Amino acid sequence: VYSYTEKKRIRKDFGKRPQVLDVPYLLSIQLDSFQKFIEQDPEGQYGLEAAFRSVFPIQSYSGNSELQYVSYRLGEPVFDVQECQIRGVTYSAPLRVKLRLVIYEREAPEGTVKDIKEQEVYMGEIPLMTDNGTFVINGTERVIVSQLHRSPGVFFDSDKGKTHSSGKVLYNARIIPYRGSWLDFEFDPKDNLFVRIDRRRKLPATIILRALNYTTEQILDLFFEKVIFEIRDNKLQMELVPERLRGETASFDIEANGKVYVEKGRRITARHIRQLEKDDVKLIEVPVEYIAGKVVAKDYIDESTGELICAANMELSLDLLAKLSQSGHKRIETLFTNDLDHGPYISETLRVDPTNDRLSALVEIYRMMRPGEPPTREAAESLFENLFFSEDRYDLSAVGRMKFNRSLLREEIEGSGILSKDDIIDVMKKLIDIRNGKGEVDDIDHLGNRRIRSVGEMAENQFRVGLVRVERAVKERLSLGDLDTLMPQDMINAKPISAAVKEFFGSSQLSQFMDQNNPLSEITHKRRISALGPGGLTRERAGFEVRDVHPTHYGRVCPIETPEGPNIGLINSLSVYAQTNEYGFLETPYRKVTDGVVTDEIHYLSAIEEGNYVIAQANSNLDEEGHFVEDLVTCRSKGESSLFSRDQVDYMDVSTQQVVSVGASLIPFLEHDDANRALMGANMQRQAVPTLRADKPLVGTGMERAVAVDSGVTAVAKRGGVVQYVDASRIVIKVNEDEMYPGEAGIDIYNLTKYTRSNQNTCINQMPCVSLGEPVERGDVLADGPSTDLGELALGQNMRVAFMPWNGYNFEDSILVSERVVQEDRFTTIHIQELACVSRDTKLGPEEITADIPNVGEAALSKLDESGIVYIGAEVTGGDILVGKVTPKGETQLTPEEKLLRAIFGEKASDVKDSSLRVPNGVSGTVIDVQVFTRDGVEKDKRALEIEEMQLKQAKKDLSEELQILEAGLFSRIRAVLVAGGVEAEKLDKLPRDRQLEQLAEQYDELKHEFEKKLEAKRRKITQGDDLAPGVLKIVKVYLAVKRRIQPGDKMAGRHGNKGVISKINPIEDMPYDENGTPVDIVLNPLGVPSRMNIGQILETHLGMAAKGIGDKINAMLKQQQEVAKLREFIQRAYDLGADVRQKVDLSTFSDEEVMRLAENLRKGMPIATPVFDGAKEAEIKELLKLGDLPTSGQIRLYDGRTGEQFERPVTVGYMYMLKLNHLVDDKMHARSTGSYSLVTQQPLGGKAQFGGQRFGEMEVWALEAYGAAYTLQEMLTVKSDDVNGRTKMYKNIVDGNHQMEPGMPESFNVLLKEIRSLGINIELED
């Protein structure tokens, strides 16, 4: 059960629910999709190999250069994650494809002239997914956020009562293509079987049938039933097929065999068909009514009488009946449709499509394409056959074809890609079913119309574009390729891919900059379900229904993760236990229940298969193995969560939490929280502050280390073993032999990011948690990312929260906190910022850094060294200069009295000025690191070269470790060779390290030879790796450092959806303390709850009192300096607290030493793994307040630090885990009234950046019109900051203090007069 991890700190396993699913790496759901994409699988595996296979053999017309595909090979990851994060270079590998370039004999049965195989062709690179689902390309990690669109298959729609606009409930269809264009269908109570093709206008269904050149008696030969009417001896009869009688009424007394089976006046529902298929009576008498109203098929004319009255397709009438029923026809084969069931759709659709041959059909479909212009006929047949039949065009594949044919209940749910005739017609038959009897419609919310574009699937989208984008210059290059000319990298370049890959994975709406502040916030960004995207369900089309919730999403769609406002149903994200189902669905974890016994087989299904299976709930009363207590269990039958016999459940949900995401799981007692404050809770954990002292939640749910292991913020170990040299930026590991590679021994290394920046420009530092001389396990931590404690997710810190009204410092949102927080500086952040600098040749003149620096003395140069660049840790403030930047001036501006003096006092007298990059106005921080980029080809002068030598030393130190361990190891082998060659052991003790000779004597040299190519390859990447950009040869990105603490005005909250802003952080001297003397740290408002309903935080408050209470037991017991047995008395109490949840006892492990560490680790509370829905109980809770020297209630009578009396009726007190948000007041307070304004417009410079004046809106204007403020509104939109000169006429005015002006003109108002002046009107105010 344990690892060294639990030896350092064991989390109390509190769980009561039998768990089965081993939570996988939470980003394997991205890795695995990426794995099925790119992988050596020439077998035909759906991925890159089937993709290339689809496009191959690539060739065009008469080029005789069929290109075949062999394999491919990926280069080495260019850099490591670390360098990609520091410099900002793409983390990818060169796609070296093995193209079988075979030229063939011109005009011959394909004989080879050259069967060349051109290997490792550079078809651009492909971003390798870092094993945390991340992508470091430019600066920091940007991640490919999964999206969602219409699942490729087939759709049926409703739109009942609103899109019907009459009361005629509509139920139509569609066919969602995989790769091509739509194929919509109609079916209104208006009686219409139509087909809206591609997207455009609605055309008749039959418009396709006749393009395939369909004869009428080929169309109706497949569709309906043919009614055989037989006139024997001039009497009218019908061969009764009661199967056809569905949708037919008893008009005449339905007689058969002489018996009246159907009295006149009661439709043949489903009773009289039974009575007629009991003896199969297919010979009945019919008067005249029953036949006069039908349509004939064959060509039967009047053969006995003699007249042309009937040929093909005609019904009967009152006049001509006269010769029709007396003529006498033997076999009258008609058509069949009935106004109730079988709608005469296609029978009337041919009567809507004015065609009868391929030619005409082609024409009208072309009109659906381009209306107004006449087609040809040959370009018409090309259009048709290549829209849905060309394999080089329309494709559906096993995804589209499965959901297509399984929604058709066929078996060919895998096969073709092009359209099959009877399949298009069967969907049409199913649509007839839909508007008459059977068949249902697929609603958008059900997975049925939802495909999850994954990381690898979205790559296949962007990369398929790459394939064709460059191919239009490859295909014709095959035709324009004679014999020995076309070769790889002669047709294909890098840009055609570079301009696409870098465009979607760099900055795209579905591949964005990961919000980086909290490891949890990171996972909830990386692993996310977006409903928006490139061809997704947007907010301008998808309204309110597409946003709503659907039952089938149990265990897959947490409705809780989403911003608060408009966009609330297209942001909702995944559930932890879930995994991506291959077709665009989601493998839903379950538990195989062989009826009455719970097996531990976890089965992944879909929502479609869920509808066929009945599933029990994980949160139900099971016993011993799975012998359900009650006779009944919650069984979600086929959508309905009814109650059934426990001996019928096929499956059961995994865990009770199997329905929501990370941010909800780590917060207990949600079985007491409101959904509104639940969304608020979700929101704020993603905005979890990057605190200095990151404390882990004492009462979590057990996924703390799970965050650390499923995230990539802490450096994990890939092998176990004693750490040898741990400093700060490096952790040198010695690996145990049981898992130590027989390849150059095995000494691993882990490099930690030390005080750097992020997207939020916030500081990130991997803090060394492992000291010196401490072994590890293959799966333990070495560092700490931001907001982590021993890997464990440590967002904020928990304090003694209370709920008492106290002098207005708690009005609804107002929060009151003890000054002790900022007096210990526990909640403070570091904002390391990057500001870009340009230099090195501006066309006006080759720029130099600093060089000639006027407008200052030498005081500014006190921190601007022999390079004119800022120090290695300066205290720059207000308006100093960061780095010197020089730029030339101008011809037109030089005066004649300085053109002459100019050509004397040097080459550059008064030309080069000082236009340096200065310290941003309004900041006071500290420059820590300088990122410089020397000119691509020519080095800098001295400082940039000093940074290279700096890098040199930091790298040298580390590579020497791994050298001396193998070099000295094999030296020990040489210490074993001289013994074999006459003992010289102690002689070598007195001799230097230089004294089977061939063998190891020479290996010593090679390791040193290796060491050489080691650091030079390392310095290769140090010397010429400063490539900046074409134009800007030298770029200098500065890294400032500014700690921003906690102060009155910062918005702070918690987890259970309790926001607020600190109104006034008061001294700890006003804090109400209990009998003890220990004051309270937090003072919140009670009044919200009865309408807020987040009571879980008042349970967390009382349970918080307990989680820390036990800590104070051991705290004081350690003050008494007690033994290992005293603490164990307490461990046993606190392990078998007050209920029978499986604590998983140990005591066979070191419950003396292994817990002695735990002692001084658990003295400040105890980390607990509690289940939300099915975990702790009130009986257990009160039992722990009793198990502590705490009040059973959890409400102590406090004594005001500003009074000292008893707050009548004991007050709510205890601990709760706080959570500070990333909303800082320095990003809110921007005062601007006077300064400088822009030049392009009178609009001031800045916004919420430098100079933050009020961008006065039109509606606040209307507020001033609701008041009498007219004179103030005057100066407001004119004299204040609108009149370019009126503002100065007011500045120079108030420097006198005279508040008195005249009715001045808006001057542009004066230009408006001149506007009318140049027209016809004019201004000449008279008198």
Added chain:
Amino acid sequence: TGGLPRVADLFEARRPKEPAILAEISGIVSFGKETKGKRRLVITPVD
């Protein structure tokens, strides 16, 4: 509706779907010319 929607149309004073017409003048009302599409609602005054 009974909120923003109907009050908005109140501002544009939209003549409804099936507008309830009021008796134009005081006096007798009668019919004439059956359904031809419309129908004569001859409201002949007595005063």
Added chain:
Amino acid sequence: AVDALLDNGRRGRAITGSNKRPLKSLADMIKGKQGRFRQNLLGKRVDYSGRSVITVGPYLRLHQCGLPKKMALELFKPFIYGKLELRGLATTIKAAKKMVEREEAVVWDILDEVIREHPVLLNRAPTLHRLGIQAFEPVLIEGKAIQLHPLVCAAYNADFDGDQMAVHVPLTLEAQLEARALMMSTNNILSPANGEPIIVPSQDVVLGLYYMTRDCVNAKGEGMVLTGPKEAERLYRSGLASLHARVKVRITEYEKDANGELVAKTSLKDTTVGRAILWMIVPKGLPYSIVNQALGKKAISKMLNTCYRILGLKPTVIFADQIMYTGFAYAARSGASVGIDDMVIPEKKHEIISEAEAEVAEIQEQFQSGLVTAGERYNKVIDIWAAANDRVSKAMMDNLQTETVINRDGQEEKQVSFNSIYMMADSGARGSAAQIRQLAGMRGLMAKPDGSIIETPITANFREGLNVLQYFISTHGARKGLADTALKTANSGYLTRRLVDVAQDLVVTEDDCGTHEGIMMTPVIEGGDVKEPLRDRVLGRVTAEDVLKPGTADILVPRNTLLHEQWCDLLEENSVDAVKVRSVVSCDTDFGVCAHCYGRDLARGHIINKGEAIGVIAAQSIGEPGTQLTSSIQVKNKGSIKLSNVKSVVNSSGKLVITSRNTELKLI
């Protein structure tokens, strides 16, 4: 060429040699969008401004706010420059720059001089209605956020989350006078939509005074006598008796028995200690009867309304501030806490659920046989569970209403349960027994994604467990709420847009004109209860004609009379039901309105003056509520059945059948 000056007229967009560019358009350059680029949202970042978030500040007096030193520097420089070269503590304005360059303690005193009595204008950004603009007085604050007076924020609807208020300096004396004329904090007491003193104690302050004035049966000292509420103060601040003991204290209540001379009436009151202390805050004129209750929120707001009616403006204002300081004071004395162990759940709740179980099981079985149809079964289910919640109501409500009995002068005389929940639920502050009862009792049936109802209730309450099932029921609810408001917001803005659209030029610019007309004002007596009275419509208007009384030939309200409270009390002394008021649509004033056709109900209670452009103030007042927008009748009213104009007749069986459509039944 002329066209080239407009744009290019309507020719073909004249470009220049080898450069796609429709040449410089004067038209667009003086005008543009939303009128012009000044009168549009484009009105630049104003000078004399400061844009930042806000904070509380209890100690902040009525007529004042707190402003950051740093913003103060940036917003008062010119005054300091003109003041430094005015007194002679700086030589030039550039020498003045240097003193503030080092922030010399000297210039801060000069800063003081230009802050002491300098009016300031405060306008928030999310401000759509005029109630987001006021005026104050500065107080030097060493901080970053703009502190604001608590009892004003409710009108601002400005909370503590990220509301950035922009500060705009009233530089000219006119603007400074406008501040202390109409925009002052003490000048925006009523809502310009209705005459109520808009600021009603929200929640914190309400509970403060609620735990103050309250009565019970058990309390230390209950029974003794004091000759003054002053020693009563020094009686509880020490704590030698409980705050709810019935103690005889001699309070000197007053009454404006005269037209300004408040005659004194010294009375003895066996009253609770809390409300006795409440009197030391109460301004004379107000009756002790209004503060002899168990405190009600409606009462507590109309108390200042009656303090405005009886005592007037001034007494109400200063009194409101006093309340705020003690509102926090005794709010703390309450220590009104609530944690898990303080709540109470009836085990009678799960007992009613047992009942609620039985019936529904049986109805689904009626369907298994085929008695009730699906829809029939549908509503049936719904009704019993709704009635079950009312029983759960009559459970937790009486429980938490008076279950605490204490031994006192007899067996155990009960007193109203002091439960915090009960206090919020009776103060009116935040206690809504409906939310509370979905929290402690069965939440109930939540709507469904269709807009209808999922017949399944949220049985398991919030204090107790909840399952994923109950969540998804309520999931549509969350969705629903968000969507509607998120969009109503935008439409409400364009709603006010159309309102300004319609009334820009209307100004009240006359007093009396020449019309003896208006329209008939009548109480909306419809359905059952008489909703809007005749009184509350005419309250604050001007009588059209000489109105007679139900008594004939006896005029009670002469033609031109300003109908206020007392005259409205006068209207309700008799039974006059229909009165005409001079309407503005009948106003004979040409291009404008006269005061004798408008009235007095405004942001004040006095006569509307010439100069009040009313068009736009109507827009804001009316456009504000945009976000809050969405068989066999047995007569329940006990009165006399009066058949008006209906021709009924008695036939067989004595049924008084109806033969006319104008059957207007009245309840005289």
